[PDB]
Amino acid sequence: SEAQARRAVADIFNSTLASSAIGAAWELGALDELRENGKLDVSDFAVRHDLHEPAVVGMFTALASVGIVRREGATVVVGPYFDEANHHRSLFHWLNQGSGELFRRMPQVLPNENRTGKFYQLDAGAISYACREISERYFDPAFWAAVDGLGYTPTTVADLGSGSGERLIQIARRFPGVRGLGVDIADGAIAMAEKEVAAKGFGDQISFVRGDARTIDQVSARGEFAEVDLLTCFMMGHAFWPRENCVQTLRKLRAAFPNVRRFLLGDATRTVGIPDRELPVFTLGFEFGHDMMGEYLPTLDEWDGVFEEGGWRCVKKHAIDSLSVSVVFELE
Amino acid sequence: VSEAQARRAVADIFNSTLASSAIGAAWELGALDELRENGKLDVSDFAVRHDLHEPAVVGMFTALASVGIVRREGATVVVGPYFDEANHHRSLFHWLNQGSGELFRRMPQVLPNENRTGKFYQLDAGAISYACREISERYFDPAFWAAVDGLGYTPTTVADLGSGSGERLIQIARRFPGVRGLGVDIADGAIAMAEKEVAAKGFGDQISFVRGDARTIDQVSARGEFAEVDLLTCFMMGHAFWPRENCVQTLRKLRAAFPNVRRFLLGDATRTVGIPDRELPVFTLGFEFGHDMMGEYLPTLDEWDGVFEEGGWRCVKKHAIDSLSVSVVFELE
Numbered sequence A: 001s002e003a004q005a006r007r008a009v010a011d012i013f014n015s016t017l018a019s020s021a022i023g024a025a026w027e028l029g030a031l032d033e034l035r036e037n038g039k040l041d042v043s044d045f046a047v048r049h050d051l052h053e054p055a056v057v058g059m060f061t062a063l064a065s066v067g068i069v070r071r072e073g074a075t076v077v078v079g080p081y082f083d084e085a086n087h088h089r090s091l092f093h094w095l096n097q098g099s100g101e102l103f104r105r106m107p108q109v110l111p112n113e114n115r116t117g118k119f120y121q122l123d124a125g126a127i128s129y130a131c132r133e134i135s136e137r138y139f140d141p142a143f144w145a146a147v148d149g150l151g152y153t154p155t156t157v158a159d160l161g162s163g164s165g166e167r168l169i170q171i172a173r174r175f176p177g178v179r180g181l182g183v184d185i186a187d188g189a190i191a192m193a194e195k196e197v198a199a200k201g202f203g204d205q206i207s208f209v210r211g212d213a214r215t216i217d218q219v220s221a222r223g224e225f226a227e228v229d230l231l232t233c234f235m236m237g238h239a240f241w242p243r244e245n246c247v248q249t250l251r252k253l254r255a256a257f258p259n260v261r262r263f264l265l266g267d268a269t270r271t272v273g274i275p276d277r278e279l280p281v282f283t284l285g286f287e288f289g290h291d292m293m294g295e296y297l298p299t300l301d302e303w304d305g306v307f308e309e310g311g312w313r314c315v316k317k318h319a320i321d322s323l324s325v326s327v328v329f330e331l332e
Numbered sequence B: 001v002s003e004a005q006a007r008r009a010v011a012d013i014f015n016s017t018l019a020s021s022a023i024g025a026a027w028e029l030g031a032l033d034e035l036r037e038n039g040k041l042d043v044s045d046f047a048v049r050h051d052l053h054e055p056a057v058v059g060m061f062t063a064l065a066s067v068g069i070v071r072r073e074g075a076t077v078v079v080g081p082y083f084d085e086a087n088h089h090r091s092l093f094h095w096l097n098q099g100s101g102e103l104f105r106r107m108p109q110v111l112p113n114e115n116r117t118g119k120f121y122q123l124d125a126g127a128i129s130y131a132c133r134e135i136s137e138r139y140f141d142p143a144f145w146a147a148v149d150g151l152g153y154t155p156t157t158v159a160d161l162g163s164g165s166g167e168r169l170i171q172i173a174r175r176f177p178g179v180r181g182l183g184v185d186i187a188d189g190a191i192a193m194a195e196k197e198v199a200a201k202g203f204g205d206q207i208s209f210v211r212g213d214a215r216t217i218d219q220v221s222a223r224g225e226f227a228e229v230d231l232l233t234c235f236m237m238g239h240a241f242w243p244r245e246n247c248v249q250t251l252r253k254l255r256a257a258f259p260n261v262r263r264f265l266l267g268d269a270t271r272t273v274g275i276p277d278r279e280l281p282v283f284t285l286g287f288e289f290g291h292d293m294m295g296e297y298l299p300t301l302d303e304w305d306g307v308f309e310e311g312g313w314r315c316v317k318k319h320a321i322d323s324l325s326v327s328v329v330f331e332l333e
Ligand SMILES: Nc1ncnc2c1ncn2[C@@H]1O[C@H](CSCC[C@H](N)C(=O)O)[C@@H](O)[C@H]1O
Pocket: A131, A132, A135, A160, A161, A162, A163, A164, A167, A183, A184, A185, A186, A189, A211, A212, A213, A214, A233, A234, A235, A236, A239
């Protein structure tokens, strides 16, 4: 019926604003205040954060329009979808603040004749902001379980796609005296990581080399790769694909880190068979986004079927809770 | 709610985001019109006919299907339960996403007072103008033509404030042959697009344009071309006259600059009041929230009703619009 359609299309429209507002409300500290108190005063919030109050009210209204919060007079209170939306806030942030410009330019990204050079734009800083919580909230538990199951004590750990350096710092805290080596293709991430590690007191223990993990055989790192006995690779593995490339990169890693015992590999994957109206959070954005960008994304089964050919054996596998289909593999 | 209902609602909000952006893109790329014709289409065929990247096309339609706009059936896409409603409002999705999406995306940077100076947000002007073209025809035409049909006289020269594409002047010239048209628009861009289009349609004799700011019309030196005007029109920009004190003066100045205008047809969307948060209809939230983000005044319907007399005008008829939020056409004289 018409009334139902009217309401469903309106919710579609409003969900757009609520979606953008989830990431924004995280970044600006509102979701944390509402989690800690169950409520807040909108004027007081606007004043304590020095925000444009009409826009703040707009922000909470968007959230309220689809049931994440409820507005009661001067006040905003948690609504029925608050816990679920707050749980997944970093994915909304990734979708909007990080990737929004990609999805927005859909009419300009889809034509074949535009798809050369730098045909889309991501907000790298925003993506990094979101990936920090995505790594801790969804991957940390399986990561540390894999670490707890190593069967040895690492002495030098190399992290591929090292980013901010956080993972290497956490391993260094777990295992006093371990040395770390982070490889990242982006000179900007090398510089940020170097700064963080120095600031946190791990400058003499953790180093960084700029390098492409897909051509790890070309990376010059003072002969340190041969000392590495734990290898880690989180949220970037899909970059090794398509399959023939992935097989060669896996062999190359096997030869460049010949004293690696365990290789812990964590990523999100492309799903198969999920009915359109049942797609869970993230899955559609991650896949559609990689398809817009022209980047390969393997399924779980494709990973499972590549290891042996690539020179590794999967000895344990961990399911991630609610990040589309995501896994951590323990390879040796 | 159970945890499962919450899971579903939040996944829906997430997927809505992609569907929303896809409605606009599907319009712009020709998909929604192909589906209207036949009720179905072949995804690969579409992709090949439009030379588009097929995996991305497949995601576009999957996003649409994710919330019930379309339904995917093997290789085909078929219209879904919300197709007609979404298609009806497609220009509003485009406006929200392809036009205004960068505004909303930058919420965390736009809200802090310290950032709100200079150029602190970015709209896609060309996308907005593409959507506004259809918004104008789809939402404002019935009431605009209703007002035109009760003028009680035959205009001889019409001036349109915020003329844009020139399309309203051209439509008036097709209904009133040998009416003359004058458009006033602040953008050099709009002026040149409109001149071109007028020429192309064979009207460059009847219709002319002048760059000018309708907020300060006394500073536009249009040559008592303004004195021959007996019909004044202004659609989709009136809220630029506000705040109230500026609105009063702008109104008086238009009255003076167009002393021979009989009727002044003023159409715009307005800020609503009192709508419950879970009942907000399409457009309302994005129009209002966006203007509050840009720091741009938006009056309510009551504010407009209370300003005309001070501004030198009498409101003789008002038309409600279906429903672009709360929109109206006022007939002033
Ligand atoms: N082919 C490649 N080789 C090395 N680093 C890469 C790469 N592809 C992407 N990266 C880096 O991988 C990072 C992905 S962000 C995820 C970071 C980190 N592994 C974590 O769990 O938090 C970015 O710094 C990017 O620069």
